[PDB]
Ligand binder design. Structure first.
Ligand SMILES: O[C@@H]1CNC[C@H]1n1cc(COc2cncc(Br)c2)nn1
Length: 330
C-alpha cells in the first residue's frame, strides 16, 4: 500500500505545517502537525478542557463506532520548547491520504498548554519519530508509521515541505519526479529515539565549505535551524547589523538586509538553504528588526535540522531494519 497527502504552511512564515488526517467511523478529519521529532499521535478532543480549546477541530470518540477506550492508559508529554499536553487513550481507525491503519492509538487531550490553545490551525500532532519515545503509560503504543510499515510497498516515508507553498508527505514510495539529482543517504542513530544523523559541515553564502561533524536530528516539528554557537555566529557575521539579542532570545537582523544562503553537508552532497528561508519577519508587528531562522542550539542541548533546513530538500525517512536518512535537492 501507499499514501499521499498535501501539507500546508499554517501561516505566512512557515511556522509549522498541517496535513489532513481521517480519524474514526464516520471519518472525522483533523489537521495534524506531522512531527518527526516526537512519537505520540494526540488530538484536541471533546474531552479537552473547554477554556483550552480556541478554534481547533476536535475528535469526539463517542461519535466514532470504531473507537475503543484503552483501559487504564494515559499519556503526558513535555516538549523541548516548553509546551505540553496530556490525556487518555483510544484506539481507532486512522487514514492519511489513502493509507489506512486500524487500531491506531489516538491520544485524546484533556489538557494542553497555552501555545497549543493559541494556535487554532493545529488540531493535534502525528508523531513520526521512533516508537521508543511514545509516552503512553503503563503500556507504550506504536506510531502510525510503525503500524503501517509492514503493509507499505517500501518501509519509508518522505517529507517535501514547501517554502510559502504546499508540499507533500508520501508513505511507502519515493516520488522520483519530486527532486533533482540523486538522493544521498546517511547513517541514523536511534539511541535517543530521533532521526539522528551527522552532517559533514557547512558553508555561509558563497564562502568556503567547512568540514566538521554536526550531530543533529531531522525534525519536521521544529520551525528553525538550531546549530552550534560557532556555526551560528559565523552565519550572522555575514549579515550587516545582525546581533544576538538577549531580550528577544536569539539573533535578529535589520529587515532590509539581504540574507546569505546557508549550505549543509550530507556526506559529499550539499543542500543549499536560500537566504530568504532564514527570514522570519518583524520581531513584533510594525518593527524593522527581524527574527533570524538560524539560532544557537546551546540552550536546547541538541542540534535540530528543523523546517528551515528540511524544506530546502526532499527528505527520505527510511524505516528499514537499519534506518537511514536521505536528502536530495529539489
Ligand atoms: O511538535 C513539537 C511540539 N511543539 C513543536 C515541536 N517541538 C520541538 C521541540 C524541540 O525543542 C525545541 C524546538 N524549537 C524551539 C525550542 Br526553544 C525548543 N519541542 N517541541
Amino acid at each position: 500500500s501507499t499514501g499521499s497527502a498535501t501539507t500546508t504552511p499554517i501561516d505566512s512564515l512557515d511556522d509549522a505545517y498541517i496535513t489532513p488526517v481521517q480519524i474514526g467511523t464516520p471519518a472525522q478529519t483533523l489537521n495534524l502537525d506531522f512531527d518527526t521529532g516526537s512519537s505520540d499521535l494526540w488530538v484536541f478532543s471533546s474531552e479537552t478542557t473547554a477554556s483550552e480549546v480556541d478554534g481547533q477541530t476536535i475528535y469526539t470518540p463517542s461519535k466514532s463506532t470504531t473507537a475503543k477506550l484503552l483501559s487504564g492508559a494515559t499519556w503526558s508529554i513535555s516538549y523541548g520548547d516548553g509546551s505540553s499536553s496530556s490525556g487518555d487513550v483510544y484506539t481507532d481507525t486512522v487514514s492519511v491520504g489513502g493509507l489506512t491503519v486500524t487500531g491506531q492509538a489516538v491520544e485524546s487531550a484533556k489538557k494542553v498548554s497555552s501555545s497549543f490553545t493559541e494556535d487554532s490551525t493545529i488540531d493535534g500532532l502525528l508523531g513520526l519519530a521512533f516508537s521508543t519515545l511514545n509516552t503512553v503509560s503503563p503500556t507504550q503504543q506504536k506510531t502510525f508509521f510503525d503500524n503501517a510499515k509492514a503493509s507499505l510497498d517500501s518501509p519509508v516515508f518522505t517529507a517535501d515541505l514547501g517554502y510559502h507553498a504546499p508540499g507533500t508527505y508520501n508513505f511507502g514510495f519515493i516520488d522520483t519526479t519530486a527532486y533533482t539529482g540523486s538522493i544521498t543517504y546517511t547513517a541514523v542513530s536511534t539511541k535517543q529515539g530521533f532521526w539522528e544523523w551527522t552532517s559533514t559541515g557547512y558553508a555561509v553564502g558563497s564562502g568556503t565549505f567547512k568540514s566538521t561533524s554536526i550531530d543533529g536530528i531531522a525534525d519536521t516539528g521544529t520551525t528553525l535551524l538550531y546549530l552550534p554557537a560557532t556555526v551560528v555566529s559565523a552565519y550572522w557575521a555575514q549579515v550587516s547589523g545582525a546581533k544576538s539579542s538577549s531580550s528577544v532570545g536569539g539573533y535578529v537582523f535589520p529587515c532590509s538586509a539581504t540574507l546569505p544562503s546557508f549550505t549543509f553537508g550530507v556526506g559529499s552532497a550539499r543542500i543549499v538553504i536560500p537566504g530568504d528561508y532564514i527570514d522570519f519577519g518583524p520581531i513584533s508587528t510594525g518593527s524593522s528588526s527581524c527574527f533570524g531562522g538560524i539560532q544557537s542550539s546551546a540552550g536546547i542541548g541538541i542540534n535540530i535540522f528543523g523546517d528551515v533546513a528540511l524544506k530546502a530538500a526532499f527528505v527520505v525517512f527510511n524505516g528499514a531494519t537499519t534506518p537511514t536518512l536521505g536528502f536530495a535537492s529539489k
